[PDB]
């Protein structure tokens, strides 16, 4: 036979191993409109109606946003917008209340509860009113038969909605 | 009540959703030694003995390499090196053969098969011999009771070994 | 050479493939005690204090319940019970309210919100009072540094608490 | 207010938690045919040609087998059978060799290596020949663009083929 010594410069002792990694996909929507009816004297919402243009989704990656519009997700061709309609506001105190409404995603509609947190009812710089507030809640993909082809393994059944709102009085 | 118009500049309609992502962890080892006995006339390995200093692991991220040395992985304090010992080379042709040997990781030992692919038996620039060759194979973490605390879900039971070798004749 | 025909009776064309399956682990606790202070005239809880003997966990499989007591979960030796202490009840209406309290699991304590749903305030068969009600809420394993070794992949970070209560007046 | 004592008989302190569980799906095929050319004097295969009726899949659960025929898997309407064609047998010894061939699944074709293990070349009860042997190997779903909609997370990219064969001489 014959004996050899490695040449460490052009020798590689390598391995490959596959692991899973959980992560949050976080996005907003650039285009939406809403109607806000709110009584500062009693700190109660009276009407809250929101429409969100699915096309305007932004999850900081253009190739995924496009993918979102396709049949296995949003179907933005057939269903161009998602809507929220307040049916009930149940007051907890002046900072806090429980908002019930109807959400529609791709033409399927379910009633949801959002947690209203009033973050400051001011009379702004110009003598005209402002308000801050947040709406927070969790919805289940399965309740809206959303992304039904994608397993609840790969992508979570749970979607967390955070809506942060500044808003000025009308006219 | 009262009516408000959003101020889109300080309003955010956001969502968070958790998804899984598979990925390969790929690494080498910077420090190892081997003994290579090989007969160019018959293109057969005669002896292949390798020792790899666990401490020298490099998976291009220093905080994971450290973690690798801990009890839930390598136990590098107690078991500072991993070893491979050839017990058998079964020739397929002059380019190809099936190497059987004993691998020991953290003091547990199993016989493995690697796929030997001879990538070129030359007589180098100076009149003295060289050889290229690769060893490739898959081993199961469970066979070596490796990382036993980490599920076969989070991290794959399968480890793929690629060893790429250039090597010069002795003395 | 030579030609052969299969004998289908002792021939098997087989395959193995690994897949993931999500599932709910659902359990109760057989031994716990509570203190219930409740005013039927205003349908408000005044005091709700609960202690649950970790040892009495029942997830319909004895080998997992034992495992639950070990260091990588409950540490039932060191921390034999988990406790809930009401700090606040915020009334929504006569059927509904938001209970805030302190939960302690393995000596770590966080304030939680449970959704109180009063399911029927009767005066029972004997002339003495009864009440039904449920408490429902979600807590995050990570908030209580629970099962910290087990990834949020293998086991969900989210735990759903359902407490169903029938309860009779005292003495 | 008022004080209550639980009625433990109609009280339940419950929890729900979601976890993942890996498992093997194991199946065979009830209907297939093959052509077997084998030389006992040199223990070499000469020809091995197999066709497997996709329709005859059996993974011990009828509702999954049906599902297997659909577009997101087999497409059994369009592609009713899968085929294996031996292109090469490389002998290791009289018990062992490396079989290369072309596998076609749903009209996509890749060359694969199977590990031939001869388990006993007898002359049977009646004076006519028999042979046992196994073929074993791993193929990647991704190489055959199989189940492309199903992630490599939910279902493994790796498929393990075990073929166990008894076989009698012809005519």
Q: Assess if residue B128 is contained within a domain.
A: yes
Burial of residue C150, with CB atoms counted within 10 A of its CB: 0-12 exposed, 13-18 middle, 19 or more buried: middle
Kind and range of the H or E element at C71? Answer: none
**Distance from the A22 Cα atom to the nearest Cα atom in chain C, whole angstroms:** 7
The answer to whether residue A112 sits within a structural domain is: yes
Query: Are the beta carbons of D92 and B96 separated by less than 8 Å?
Result: no
- Is A31 inside a domain boundary? yes
Residues A146 and A155 sit within 8 Å (Cβ to Cβ): no
CA C125 to each of CA A76, C6, C19, C40, C171: distance values in angstroms, whole numbers, following the listed order? 59, 77, 54, 17, 16
Judge contact between C53 and C33, C-beta under 8 A: no
Both tokens assigned to C142? 């990570």
Q: How many residues does chain D have?
A: 171
How is B85-152 classified by DSSP, letter by letter?
EEEEEEE-SSSEEEEEEEEEETTEEEEEEEEEEE----B-TTSSBEEEEEEEEEEEGGGGTTTTTS-T
Chain A and chain D share a number of CB contacts under 8 A equal to 10
Resolution of the experimental model in angstroms, please? 2.7
Strands (E), chain C: 3-6, 12-29, 32-39, 44-53, 57-58, 81-91, 96-105, 108-118, 130-140, 155-169
C96 lies in some domain: yes
The Cα–Cα gap between C153 and D151 comes to 16
Task: Quote the CA–CA distance of B153 and A87 in Å, as a whole number.
Answer: 44
Residue D55 · residue D32 · CB < 8 Å = no
Q: How many other C-beta atoms lie within 10 A of the C-beta of residue C105?
A: 24
Q: Cα separation of A124 and A116, whole Å?
A: 21
C-alpha C120, offset from chain centre: 23
Query: How far is it, in rounded angstroms, from Cα B90 to Cα A85?
Result: 73
Residue B145, beta-bridge partner list: none
Burial class (CB in 10 A: 0-12, 13-18, 19+), B114: buried
- Pick from B161, D24, B53: nearest CA to A17: B161
| Nearest CB to A26 within list B16, B33, B131 | B16
Backbone angles phi, psi at B167, to 5 degrees: -165, 130
At residue D69, the 3 state secondary structure works out as helix
CA distance A119 to A134: 7
Q: Does C153 touch chain B (CB under 8 A)?
A: yes
CA C45 to chain centroid, in Å, comes to 21
Judge contact between B86 and B36, C-beta under 8 A: no
Minimum CA–CA partner of B152 in chain C = C154
Contact D137, D161 (CB under 8 A): yes
Which residue from B126, B100, B107 is spatially nearest to B45, judged by alpha carbons?
A: B100
> What is the secondary structure of D45-81 as a DSSP string?
EEEEEEEEEGGGEE-S-HHHHHHHHSTTTT-TTT--E
The closest CB to that of D155, out of C19, C23, C153, belongs to C19
**D21 to chain B: nearest residue by CA?**
B153
Question: Tell me, what DSSP letter sits at residue A143?
Answer: G
Q: Could you tell me if D57 and D65 are in contact, meaning their C-beta atoms sit under 8 angstroms apart?
A: yes
C-beta separation of A59 from A25 below 8 A: yes
Cβ within 8 Å, pair B22-D96: no
Please name the residue of chain C whose CA is at the shortest distance from the CA of residue A99: C92
Q: Is residue C51 part of a domain?
A: yes
With contact defined as beta carbons under 8 Å apart, do D145 and D129 qualify? no
Q: For residue B70, give how far its alpha carbon lies from the nearest alpha carbon of chain C (Å).
A: 14
Asked if D1 and C46 count as a contact pair (C-beta separation under 8 A), the reply is: yes
In DSSP terms, C39 is beta-bridged to C44
Q: State how far the Cα of D109 lies from the Cα of B33, in Å rounded to an integer.
A: 42
State how far the Cα of D153 lies from the Cα of D171, in Å rounded to an integer.
Answer: 49
Do C17 and D25 lie within an 8 Å CB cutoff? yes
Rounded distance between C-alpha atoms, residue A105 and residue A76, angstroms? 10
Token pair listed for A146 = 């959303």
Domain membership flag for residue B3: no
Residue of B nearest to A10 (CA): B166
The answer to whether the Cβ–Cβ distance between B92 and D92 falls below 8 Å is: yes
Domain span including residue C65: 22-171
Chain-centroid distance of CA B77 in Å reads 20
Length of chain A in terms of residues written: 171
CA C70/CA B44 separation, integer angstroms = 53
Helices vs. strands in chain A: H and E counts, helices first: 1, 10
Sign of CA dihedral A75, A76, A80, A83: positive
| Number of domains within chain A | 1
Q: What is the CATH number of the domain that holds C129?
A: 2.40.128.110
Experimentally, the structure was elucidated by X-ray
C3-6 vs D57-58, strand pairing mode = unpaired
Half-sphere exposure at residue B103, Cβ-oriented, CA atoms within 13 angstroms: 18
Cα A5 to Cα B34: distance, rounded to the nearest angstrom: 7
C126: contact with D, CB 8 A cutoff: no
- HSE, CB side, 13 Å, CA atoms: give it for residue C9: 2
| 3-state secondary structure (DSSP) of residue A125 | coil
CA distances from A153 to A21, B17, B117, C16, C19 (A): 12, 12, 39, 21, 11
Print burial letters for B29-44: b (CB count within 10 Å at least 16), e (below 16). beebebebbbebeebb
Q: Give the separation between CA B45 and CA B114, rounded to whole angstroms.
A: 12
Query: Of D6, D11, D14, which Cα lies nearest the Cα of C36?
Result: D6
Sign of CA dihedral D95, D98, D99, D103: positive
Q: For B144, phi and psi rounded to 5 degrees? A: -120, 20
First to last CA, chain B: 95
In a domain, A4, yes or no: no
b/e per residue C73-93 (b: at least 16 CB within 10 A):
bbebeeeebbebbbeebeebe
Which residues 20-79 of C have a C-beta within 8 angstroms of D?
A: 20-29, 32-40, 46, 50, 52
Question: What is the Cβ-side half-sphere exposure of residue B21, based on CA atoms within 13 angstroms?
Answer: 10
Residue among D59, D86, D87, D60 at smallest CA distance from D74? D59
Q: Hey, are the CB atoms on B92 and D90 less than 8 Å from each other?
A: yes
Q: Please give the residue of chain B at the shortest CA–CA distance from A1.
A: B39
Residue A16 falls within a domain, yes or no? Answer: no
- Measured CA to CA, the distance from residue C111 to residue C101 in angstroms comes to 5
Residue A138: in which H helix or E strand, if any?
A: strand A130-140
Cβ atoms within 10 Å of B77's Cβ, excluding its own? 11
Q: How far apart are the C-alpha atoms of D117 and D88, rounded to whole Å?
A: 15
């Amino acid at each position: 036979m014959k004996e050899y010594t490695l040449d460490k410069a052009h020798t590689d002792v390598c391995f490959k191993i596959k692991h899973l990694q959980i992560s949050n996909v976080k996005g907003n929507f650039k285009d939406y409109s809403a109607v806000i009816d709110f009584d500062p004297a009693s700190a109660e919402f009276k009407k809250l109606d929101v429409t969100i243009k699915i096309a305007s989704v932004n999850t900081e990656n253009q190739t995924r946003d496009n993918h979102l519009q396709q049949d296995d997700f949003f179907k933005a061709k057939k269903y161009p917008d998602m809507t929220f309609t307040m049916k009930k506001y149940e007051k907890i105190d002046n900072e806090k209340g429980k908002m019930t409404g109807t959400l529609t995603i791709a033409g399927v509609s379910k009633d949801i509860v959002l947690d209203a947190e009033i973050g400051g009812v001011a009379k702004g710089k110009d003598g005209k009113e402002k308000i801050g507030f947040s709406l927070n809640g969790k919805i289940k993909r399965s309740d809206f038969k959303f992304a039904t082809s994608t397993s609840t393994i790969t992508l979570s059944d749970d979607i967390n909605l955070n809506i942060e709102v500044e808003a000025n009085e009308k006219e």
